[PDB]
Amino acid sequence: MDSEPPSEISLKNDLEKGDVKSKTEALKKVIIMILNGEKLPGLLMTIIRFVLPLQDHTIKKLLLVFWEIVPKTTPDGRLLHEMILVCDAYRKDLQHPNEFIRGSTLRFLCKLKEAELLEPLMPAIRACLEHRHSYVRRNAVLAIYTIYRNFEHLIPDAPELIHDFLVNEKDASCKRNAFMMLIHADQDRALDYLSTCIDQVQTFGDILQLVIVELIYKVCHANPSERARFIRCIYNLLQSSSPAVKYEAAGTLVTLSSAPTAIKAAAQCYIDLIIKESDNNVKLIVLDRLVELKEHPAHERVLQDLVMDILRVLSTPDLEVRKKTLQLALDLVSSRNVEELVIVLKKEVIKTNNVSEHEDTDKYRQLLVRTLHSCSVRFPDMAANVIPVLMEFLSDSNEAAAADVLEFVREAIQRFDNLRMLIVEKMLEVFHAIKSVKIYRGALWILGEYCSTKEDIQSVMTEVRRSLGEIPIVESEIKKEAGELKPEEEITVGPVQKLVTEMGTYATQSALSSSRPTKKEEDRPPLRGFLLDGDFFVAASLATTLTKIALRYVALVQEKKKQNSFVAEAMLLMATILHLGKSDPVYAEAYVHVNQYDIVLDVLVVNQTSDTLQNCTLELATLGDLKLVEKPSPLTLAPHDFANIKANVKVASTENGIIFGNIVYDVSGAASDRNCVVLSDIHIDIMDYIQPATCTDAEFRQMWAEFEWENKVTVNTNMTDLNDYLQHILKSTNMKCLTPEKALSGYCGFMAANLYARSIFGEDALANVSIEKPVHQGPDAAVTGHIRIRAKSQGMALSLGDKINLSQKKTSL
């Protein structure tokens, strides 16, 4: 009988039957239905009658079982007395020669904090005063303590009965087996006795002595219990810069992340921390101790650095461990992050050296070039390293492989003015075999800026200019680029001037030069030719032309703040980006009142009628996410009764199977068809059910992408900013205004709120409230705001859309 709540009639029958097995099974079936929480008092006389005196342990044990989980509730066969049918003949049970029945009886009897059993539990310590097992003596210290807990904090429970009444706790210390139920409030002499016992311990018992009294002067003295306290005590005597090298903490710690890569990744972190405490700049974070595994002697054999190499990773162990490991290389050794990121990047970025680090997918290659290159932009020393490695990247000599390479290096030159003169000659080489945009773009920029340095350019450019591949974006990049630097410093059959001619043709003009350009018609609609066409005031010469622009870098460009940079090593970053970091007539009148922060729905129940409505009961219901914190409890609604009855309200619950409308309120009365009527007290909305939750800009952005929010409305009374009406109203449809999606200035400055919720509707809810408050001569519609809304199938989107207008209720009875 797993859980069957109607079966009590059969149990009575089964409980006495003249067959002992049946009786045991019955009583067992009662236990299992109560434990789940089901019907049990009908049976009581039957249950109690067979078992009572006997020394036959199994039925007695079963009855003994049922007296610690419901004795108080059941009363057919027990009623209320001092020597109840729980203990009257269980004084026999306590005083049987078999330890088990006595012991069991003692154990339940003393366990209860019952006051209708207080006297019978007190000399119940007799059953276990003699200690036939470790179990008997432990059973005794726990039972005396449980007696002490049960209203006997004074002389009824404190001395000895004949050996224990609160003194097993003392005795246990010096006896062969220990266990101290003495944790609080008990004899001082036993506490003292436990200390002595630390030495003459029994190990289970030591965990009991130890919860009470901890800290040792020793190293130990033995056993897991003492050992477990000991690592706590050690952390005290050296708190300083974490544990560093984990103590006896290490054993539990592995299981704490049994799923399976995460342990190594964690372990790797600690091992890296431990090596050294470095400068602790941007991603140079290694704490713990400065010297404890050093770094870097030149006589150390086979050195520290061997372990450091693991941390430099491509994936060399698996991805979770990889992400931890790349950060960890950066963390022990660099200048900041820059130094060790360049080494690390050199390995990752595409080459002709190894083909286990090159790939023909263009974005990844490109990104890897940008990561290597960002280190230079960060720190100078890296410029010198980067440029020759970049030329190796080029040497791959696939159209695309060159292409990616050329694209970053060209950015580097914008930063690094006439420093990378050397690269230009390498960069031209792979520009001729071509099937893509990227190669043309980049090459034309290097060869263009670099012209003073070289003289090749008609020849290199011209094979490509009459070759094909994909050429949209090529136009833009060649347009600003081709002439640049020194007015007449090249010549192969086209000097720098031919280049300016070319540069202009490629931009949007027409001219025979480099055997004509591939295309002329520019990239995306805004860019066009014209700016540059106007430009080249002084023909490709460092002055105030293309050259200027080329040998200068747009805004601030420093660090790895992503200003001509990309922020570490490209593969590690994907993982970091991913991390969102999300945090019968009846009359009612009613108002909601709050006194001393108690929120209640006031209801007055009125019988305007002369007719009888007796049988009157009042209930507030649990609909779904609405709940009663206590229904109105008066038996009112009688002939010409006016009553004030208070129903307390909650807003947060779990969905019930009954209707999901406004608030259900139920009054009952006389009638047999409609004994229960549902009638209303004032408004509560569907919107309550939504649950508020919040987003950060990353979670908002991810969800924006994840599912559409095209749906918009413009809501009146969003004249005001985010903070005022809009927040308060948004709150009531369990929403909250978080992070921005705005871009403010002297022409821009709609207020933008990123909203989130996680509705109990199987959807989230998100929105952006844009408040069109004029920051221009031509506003949208002046003050008002357009709320762009969604939910996960946009079923709550709509709630956001209208619950940001207005919202107010009041009455004054």
């Binding site: 940008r370 694209e407 970053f408 950015e411 914008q414 773009r441 974006i473 833009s476 990049e477 600003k480 680029e481 520019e522 990239d523 995306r524 609609p525 805004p526 860019l527 066009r528 014209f530 700016l531 540059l532 106007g534 430009d535 105030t544 200027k548 622009i549 200068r552 747009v554 805004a555 601030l556 460009v557 200003q563 001509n564 940079s565 952005r701 924006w704 992408a705 559409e708 929010w709 095209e710 918009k712 705005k742 871009a743 403010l744 200035s745 002297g746 022409y747 821009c748 400055g749 709609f750 933008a752 952006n768 069109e772 004029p774 920051v775 221009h776 001569q777 506003p779 357009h786 762009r788």
Partner: protein, 133 residues
């Protein structure tokens, strides 16, 4: 309004259309601030060609309307509309011409802020064959 859709799955092209049109018209019909706020988010997570488009458009947008210059500056300093890759190069040019230079060039360049080419009306014939295939 259409741009409200989907931040980066809407594609390079829609962002390029609101961007190109907002650049070129220079809205006084609605406040450009919604448009700018919408485009600003799209650029971050969408392709190079649009992000490059967005800086150059902004520059033309500057030259045609004086008002606009403050938004150009918040957008261009960002790691997005400048300082990516292609976006940087175009930006360095477009920015420097607006910021630094006379804007003889910028002024000249905007004639409305028009597209890169004016073809015929391509869609209708394409559509005719394509539908009962």
């Amino acid at each position: 309004h259409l741009c409200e859709f989907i931040e980066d799955c809407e594609f390079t092209v829609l962002a390029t259309r609101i961007l190109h049109l907002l650049g070129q018209e220079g809205p006084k019909t609605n406040n450009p601030s919604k448009y700018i706020r919408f485009i600003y988010n799209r650029v971050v997570l969408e392709h190079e060609e649009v992000r490059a488009g967005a800086v150059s458009a902004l520059a033309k947008f500057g030259a045609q309307n004086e008002e606009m210059l403050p938004s150009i500056l918040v957008l261009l300093k960002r790691c997005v509309m400048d300082d990516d890759n292609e976006v940087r190069d175009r930006a360095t040019f477009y920015l420097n011409v607006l910021e630094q230079k006379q804007k003889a060039l910028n002024a000249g360049y905007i004639l409305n802020g028009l597209t890169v080419s004016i073809p015929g009306l391509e869609k209708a014939l394409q559509q005719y064959t394509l539908e009962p295939s």
